[PDB]
Structure 1
């Protein structure tokens, strides 16, 4: 059914969801489910007549994300013919049994939207839930957790959204909106400093970060007064040493740790005094949150 109402767009923008990218994910998702034909089960067992109330509820505890996008799915499928009794907001915690949403619509259109709505909800909520677990291992300290570009193909802007709902911070969104000098770059550049100066000269407008793999390279970029340094696969002892040299430099470089991080060692790392943790697992190994859709009897 084409595209959705302007009301849905205002709801998506109000949430900080890129509405154009959300349309592309939603329409793609429904095509995967409907390209083999109409819902053969529902059309045989459910009158084209019925309307039900339906409850989206969690079977386990975590953080909710994706509710405006799931309602966009339903808006598209029902052509706006639905009504909402109750909803939670993305960011809210849910225990088992809690109701994220209660809606009423045509029973057949609910059966068509269900799996698409829940796949989004369960994945985005899984990302927000894991992000919150990391952010909680960082209480007591001033450390913050960040995502990366290790997102799933097609879902980057929505996974970034879900990390924010979990209390995390986004890193850059693509290759052209920020400079991040990695190892392949420092190879061809000759040193880390040459690469840092090359990027600053070539694109002085952009934010800039350099990823280092040794304390020596860390010394180069500190001398050049790098705004931000990423410590690739440092042990907790090495981070303490990195933080000492940073504190003794003329420039206050923000330090981010990346590579070799797990939820347990997270508090040990945060304790060294690094400012940021960059965790790929937030968006590429986030277990889904178990949410389900039930019809009112």
Structure 2
């Protein structure tokens, strides 16, 4: 059905969704479902001229994300022949039974679109829902939660979007848009300070963060006025000490805790005064939110 309508492109861009990446994801997903042939079940049991109303409804409480992409799927499958009666916005809180979308379209085309629409909605809503749980554990502090490059293959930009819809902040998108010095770079470079100085000199225009595993490495990069330091697998007490040394250096380096973190210790870490938590699980281990598509009776 080759590409959807410009109205759908505008809705994707209005939402901050990368439209070319979303097209690749959608076209690929439909292909996974249709490469063995037409929908035999529906073609045998549903008339070609049937049209129906359908409701996308949540079965669990959580945060909605990906509804513009699901509409792009339906737009593509129907060639634009659908009408929306009702829709919630990405970022909205849903409870069980809440209706996220009500649409009318040819019944056979809804049956083809349904599973691709839901696989996208449920995963992205699951990401935004988990992100919101982490963000809520940070209430009462100024701490924020951030994601990582531990995304699922092919879904990076959509999952980064979902993290934003859940109240999280995006970490860098790839290897070339920001520096993140890690232990292999510190070993190679000769010290934490040497790696930090080499990165600053090689690409002075990029954001620069250095990950440390010890308080000794932290002292080095504070002495060089690093803008942002990732504290790798620090205990809560080591974070308090790290924050103490940061406050005394009066460089106002941002501190980001990472590694060894779970939702039940997130509030404890935020209380130490670190500025950020970096959480891989937001994208690599987010349980899907259970949404279903139900035809009108």
Q: Same-fold call, TM > 0.5?
A: yes
2: CA distance between counterparts of 1:184 and 1:296? 57
2: CA distance between counterparts of 1:269 and 1:29? 39
1:172 aligned residue: 172
2: CA distance between counterparts of 1:113 and 1:194? 54
> Aligned with 2:55: secondary structure?
strand
Question: Which whole-Å deviations, capped at 9, do the CAs of 1:174-214 have from their partners, x for residues lacking one?
Answer: 00000000111001001000000000000000000000000
Matches within 5 A, 1:123-272: 123-272=123-272
1:96 aligned onto 2:100: no
2: CA distance between counterparts of 1:276 and 1:245? 17
2: CA distance between counterparts of 1:183 and 1:79? 51
> Aligned with 2:240: secondary structure?
helix
2: CA distance between counterparts of 1:138 and 1:89? 24
Question: Which whole-Å deviations, capped at 9, do the CAs of 1:95-129 have from their partners, x for residues lacking one?
Answer: 00000000000000000000000000000000000
1: CA distance between counterparts of 2:207 and 2:188? 21
1: CA distance between counterparts of 2:188 and 2:170? 28
- Moved runs in structure 1, 4+ residues, more than 2 A? none
> Aligned with 2:180: secondary structure?
strand
Q: Is the 8 A contact 1:231 1:255 kept in 2?
A: yes
Q: Is the 8 A contact 1:22 1:69 kept in 2?
A: yes
Q: What TM-score do you get using the length of structure 2 for normalisation?
A: 1.00
1: CA distance between counterparts of 2:185 and 2:43? 57
> Aligned with 1:84: secondary structure?
strand
1: CA distance between counterparts of 2:250 and 2:93? 43
Shift in Å at residue 237 of structure 1?
Answer: 0.4
1:296 aligned residue: 296
1:12 aligned residue: 12
2: CA distance between counterparts of 1:194 and 1:48? 68
Q: Is the 8 A contact 1:143 1:270 kept in 2?
A: yes
1: CA distance between counterparts of 2:187 and 2:39? 55
Shift in Å at residue 130 of structure 1?
Answer: 0.2
Question: Which whole-Å deviations, capped at 9, do the CAs of 1:58-87 have from their partners, x for residues lacking one?
Answer: 001000000000000000000000000000
2: CA distance between counterparts of 1:167 and 1:233? 24
Matches within 5 A, 1:28-47: 28-47=28-47
Q: Is the 8 A contact 1:63 1:129 kept in 2?
A: yes
Shift in Å at residue 250 of structure 1?
Answer: 3.3
2: CA distance between counterparts of 1:47 and 1:67? 28
Q: Is the 8 A contact 1:225 1:250 kept in 2?
A: no
2: CA distance between counterparts of 1:187 and 1:77? 53
Specify every segment of 5 or more residues in structure 2 that has no aligned partner in the other structure, as ranges: none
2: CA distance between counterparts of 1:25 and 1:139? 35
- RMSD, aligned CA: 0.3
1: CA distance between counterparts of 2:223 and 2:15? 42
Q: What TM-score do you get using the length of structure 1 for normalisation?
A: 1.00
> Aligned with 2:196: secondary structure?
helix
2: CA distance between counterparts of 1:148 and 1:271? 22
1: CA distance between counterparts of 2:205 and 2:254? 18
> Aligned with 1:74: secondary structure?
helix
